[PDB]
Symmetry: D2
Subunit: 389 residues, 4 copies
């Protein structure tokens, strides 16, 4: 078409290019044959160390950090250096690590985001990108995005407006879509929309990473959000999931009402909460969201969103329907069970969500497979290291 | 005839640029650099200066409870934003030296397998026999100037740490860059893995080396010969090979052999001799007297022990104009068996150090035993009884292995001792650290900038005299014989100029003709870690 | 469990961008693109349009004295600026087809080693046994849609050219892209090298293949089985495997076996059948008559001869509702031993047996023409000048408008020329050839003989399978393609003597063929791209690769 | 403070390796190299040596009908496999010099836009004012040793070809590599585009330059000053800047100005004087006599005529220890108005005045020959057939062995042919020409007249400057190069009539010239690679780039 394209060059990763790619880096788990074939001989010490031994070593060091924020920083650095090791470690130690990678330590990470800023994660779209949102998306090196987790940072947990530093939440949430729901991490895209912040402490902080101005509202905000949602559809198509999160309530409801008619969209604070509380049973975002779903039919949202996201992706759903939330709740209640078997739980939720998408005529991956549970499991990302040619 | 690696070059942009520690500026990339290199959106909107990034990193680093955690964060920084790492290190050298170098670097080697993070340096093992050149070809920097090589057999006073000895050459080269201005892209840390005799490491599931006992004799010699031939073939005649943390017999044999055919330096032998001699020249400028009027007694007669003693005798002969054999008579050493061959003078056989202190009556006492608490209250009180201002050097590293602490040296002598240590000590009197990092960066720079092809003993004398010339009344009043590390870049420039002048004078320099102002020339050659602006 | 290749991605700039034929625009990079991708100074100041670059290339190409030199310049262009190559090919298709396809491509295969330039395609040899999957992993495009594979044993009528047979699939795929709109990044030309029986090539110091005689039997079978299993493992169930230039027994065996397990077709058998049936339907629309009323006589009874005869009998059975066995009765073929007859049955190759009707033996084509009195004569012999003056005059005595197809390639192998067909029939023959012939001036008229080029069918058939997500080729898709092409042949081309529409409107023709093939895939329950779009012609067009330059960020 | 380009390095493999002309070996990659660099399957099975690739290339090249087609194939090879290009060029230098260099390179400049293929060199235009350093940063080789630059105002005898003048520095640098052993990665061809006064090019839709008239004065000066400052800033004090194909006055001004601040050579001015002086020293070695004993007469008193005359007078002053003014006394020149004499001084261009000796005015060359009775006659007029039968016969009457140099280029402009020189002197002329003539059969002998090709001198001169780390060019280095080239002319070439040794041994010749130039740099205190090696010939040879393929890890 007429729109500009990024010219991408592809080559075999070897040497430090391979060691510095978190998607391909195995660290000391590269075998002697892989080291010889990819020009790593001498760049690594002689020992070949399995994924399991690397997990053990990482957990031993992590437990020696005095502060939870230091465990969070070591986890983010791991995610951005050896992705497969990060996901396998997270899956195997989910109960111990969820408080570090997610709530509550992820909230403290957003408060201190500027001061602890390390390896770059996610994509930032600000007011300075007006008229250029598509151009910003073209810098993202993964073409086939399936799940976007987006925030404007206005309502981070119970911590309020954390502006551009709200990025820690979509980054944390997507790690859970991968670890708990098996969504491929290369298909995940955390986004922060920076329209300024009303947080005076952050506006005075020399380490703040966002636009140093008060929060845009009304038409200026609306125009950027409309350009963003149009750019996401133009570039990623009709099937991309846009998961809104940690937006202020009036905005969260307006965004959900508007974009749920034109895109595949859901708001975990409104809909995920309503779904998990209903599954449990069997006046804001949560209060009215839950009340509505009750009338229609640990309370952690991570029991529902990973399986729900997986169910939408595997069915090629183009819209989220309230009946999918009812199906996700019934599937969870049929299984609260612990987070130790979250992958099996997510497969059952994904199969129930996918079945509803087919029944409502909202699925595009046609015809539906006969066993949706086995199909969901076959689609789940496995963080076991690959063997290299 | 030899195979070559086909390298492809392209403009770094996007994540390729962000993941290259040599070019990554993090949030310091300007809006124009972000637009030009496809970073827009990959980074949050703020542009954050190198100075703000230093402040942020130091704030976080000070919150780590353990020194090893500070070391780990420093290694990760070196391997993510190297300019930031070097600028931070230079500006906070006094605070950070104990974390990036001695003593924490020793603990890093002990735990190296368990804390393994980003890959650093090059490993050459017994499995690479007949393929050493092929291994060097994998190193992505063609113009190597300084190689720091070890086999991990003598790590500080911690003994055999095998392949885990890599932490020392990695730390040493960070100091050649930060303190001496050697370009980091021209630095190559190497560990030679021939196995280890450390049974705990051989049993450790996290050990990173060959899980075998050390090779010795012909098998070892053949690998070392192939390694030294490969280094000359690939990097030429002017590459500096700095040997470090080798066991004593091996260290002396390697130095004797390769100093005739390559530009080589053994920091444990020669760097130590140079820094201690400078310390002695400075101490004599603070307390009075000459080198010839002194009586020397060493505890430990290995690399450091005989290394220092040999240079003391050399400087004494240049001043007195007398033969070196005569200058050796007033220098004594005590090994594990009691009171290497040029030092065995005619004397009654004594076993304990205390009995040697009473019989010899030294004015200078130097500890290089690698054994802790060997300088007892009795020995230090005897030194204070024999001399008005006894000169005591307790050099054994790490801190637990030190012969005595600074607190002990000043308390037992009633504040009369002239103290210097190998380990970093807190003020009591500001104890001087007889740190080799005062000499090797400037010495290394001096050899590189002059295009020296051989190290000569007179360059060690020139390096010692230039460091002593930097020790003024400003540091003497505090009780420190050495100038502080705060002005290490200026000190290194003076050392480099003195070493380069010596190379030209001896006909060993190849960068001809010599520049007129060698100090200004050394400074102009020093790597600056200020961020570059990008096209 | 299987090993994977670790691929690294980065923004192409400078010489990396200039040396990538997929992104290189040469002097068409704008000043803004040059600034953004570090090209400023690497190129002279002028910005030169794709249209000006086409003109400049065509000017230079017309100055080469030898057709092989035009072919070499075309291959070098394909491997330096592929968008320019495809746009130039589409715009100058009539002029360039003889250089990039038959006949020049036959000469290119004969001289392939001596003219070897930029690497094209993938070679899988006997030395790759047990490592075929590893070889496929070196191919830098993961989502392959169309594979054109050869072992080079039957190149045109030239026989065995071994590893140098690679010129054919490379040429065919450029036509799937230029004429059918298949994305070139989704095309994969493959040569399977099992050696060659060509003694001249084995003695040639410039030969590029294994310097051995052809492997046969078990060793060959095991490599082919490993190859077909590797293609399915790596590219999935929907990849199209188009077999080409295989010798006849092998071609029929490969087609019978792999058509049950993969999406396959053999262009020499099925593609030829489909274009020739379209030509016959067009000839009958031009001159009147039905398929059933005809009497057919073929010279040559191999891949093309029997493949075409089968599709004629099949189309006839659909039109008449009669059994296919009854429809084969007025179809006759002459091989190297003479007329194929019932008395010869025991010694015939199986593909010949359905055509062995009861009849006295006849040893020459002339005798077969006089005894059988065909209304349609088709040459697929590989032997030039076999449609003699006497044979063509007998056709013109037997028929008011004899239908004569001289399909053997390259040109020197044609059974007769267009000049001969029109002169020898006093301008009454309905003529078509495999080789391009110039217009013929006869009496006061100009005759433009149609070329029964497989490229009229395979690009659209390939696109139709891809866009519908077809998992199997069905014979009814070949009939749908033939009917779609014949529907494009009108009075506009008939008035000039051409039974085919010209290649100038090939993109539109391929869209109609693709839509008819895709409709057939949906109707037969063989399509996986569900649901079918309502307008399959508009859908086919929307899927076609456009070689217009992109604008770069 | 200045911005830097962030460069990323990685191991080349697959198509990245095949598309890099510096590393690409084509079919010469061994099976082990193919396995190690992910090429298995990307190439056909045969491993074909560098020698076989040279043979294959030469076979194809000889089949092109047009010389420009040979040139295009050569440029495409240079930009696909440079080691193959250089090894082929070295081995076939006599045959290929007329295609890669003069005269075909001039035709290439005239048609540069219409034949534009793979990008070569760097373009700096008026649009780059204030950004010249930024343009140099896009060049992917950091350690440039030799820059060949033009503004294309005077290409051979073809005039102003503007931006299309790039073909000359590209050709000249291929010769610094092939003939002199300068590493090609250290060579940088540059065209400065300030517009063109060529109306045919400004009207040509395929012109590649700024479509404007040529800038002059301050605008031109400011770009040239920024360019020369950028070259020093980025490449240092030791980079060689070789000016070429500039108009006479501009070339003079640029050489006078930048010779004081940079390492600067103008091949047209300085290389020409050096090669003709070498021819004269060799002619005198062949037939006997000294420079001082000769009487010189030139037809043409321009850049070449006066440049050569000055270098002859300079060498004569060194040999005799006499002032150069005394050495100019037996050197005479005839311009378009006749003999340059003292009485004409008021109307002469200042550069002609040192040659205006006292003498009666003479209007024809014939009268000048009869009156002056030269022993040496040199044609630098640009006017063909001005060395008439009468003139050549008079030279043979005056001298037993007349030395006749007909240096005007191309052969159509030559003052006389080799056939004419030998016939008109009964085989007694010592003849050389600027352009090649075929051997001459006269009496029972074969005469091979030598050519005053600048390519004999500049490769070795450039190498001599590079290897010694010279910071300035001195006129004595030109004398050392001439003496070194003449020393290579032996009885082996004299017996055939050639005063120059053949180009077949050019690598050895260049090593001797390089050693003599380097020795001169050390002697004059202009060399920085200190101390000088003891054997400068062996040192020059050890520095020469060898185009034999590397083995890959």
């Amino acid at each position: 078409e007429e729109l500009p394209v990024m010219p991408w060059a592809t080559s075999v990763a070897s040497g430090y290019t391979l060691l510095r790619d978190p998607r391909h880096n195995k660290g000391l788990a590269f075998t002697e044959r892989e080291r010889d074939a990819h020009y790593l001989r001498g760049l690594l010490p002689p020992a070949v160390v399995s994924q399991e031994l690397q997990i053990k070593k990482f957990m031993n060091n992590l437990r020696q950090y005095q502060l939870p924020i230091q465990c969070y920083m070591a986890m983010m650095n791991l995610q951005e250096t050896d992705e497969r090791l990060f996901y396998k470690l997270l899956i195997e130690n989910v109960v111990e690590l969820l408080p570090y990678v997610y709530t509550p330590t992820v909230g403290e990470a957003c408060q201190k985001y500027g001061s602890i800023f390390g390896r770059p994660q996610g994509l930032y779209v600000s007011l300075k990108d007006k008229g250029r949102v598509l151009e910003v998306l073209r810098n993202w090196p993964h073409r086939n995005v399936q799940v976007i987790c987006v925030t404007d940072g206005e309502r981070i947990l119970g911590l309020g407006d954390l502006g551009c530093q709200g990025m820690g939440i979509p980054v944390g949430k997507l790690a859970l879509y991968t670890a708990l729901g098996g969504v491929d991490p290369s298909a995940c895209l955390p986004i922060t929309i920076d329209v300024g912040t009303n947080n005076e402490k952050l506006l005075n902080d020399e380490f703040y990473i966002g636009l140093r101005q008060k929060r845009a509202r009304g038409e200026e905000y609306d125009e950027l959000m409309e350009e963003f949602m149009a750019a996401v559809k133009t570039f990623y198509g009709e099937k991309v999931l846009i998961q809104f999160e940690d937006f202020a309530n009036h905005n969260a409801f307006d965004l959900l009402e508007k974009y749920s008619k034109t895109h595949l969209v859901f708001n975990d604070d409104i809909q995920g909460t309503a779904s998990v509380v209903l599954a449990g049973l069997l006046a804001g975002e949560a209060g009215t969201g839950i009340a509505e779903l009750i009338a229609l039919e640990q309370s952690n949202n991570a029991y529902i969103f990973p399986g729900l996201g997986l169910g939408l992706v595997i069915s090629g759903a183009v819209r989220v329907h309230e009946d999918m939330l009812l199906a996700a709740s019934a599937a969870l209640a049929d299984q609260f069970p612990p987070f130790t078997n979250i992958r099996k739980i997510s497969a059952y939720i994904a199969a129930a969500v996918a079945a509803k998408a087919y029944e409502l005529g909202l699925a595009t991956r046609l015809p539906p497979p006969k066993d949706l549970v086995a199909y969901a499991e076959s689609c789940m990302y496995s963080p076991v290291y690959r063997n290299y040619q």
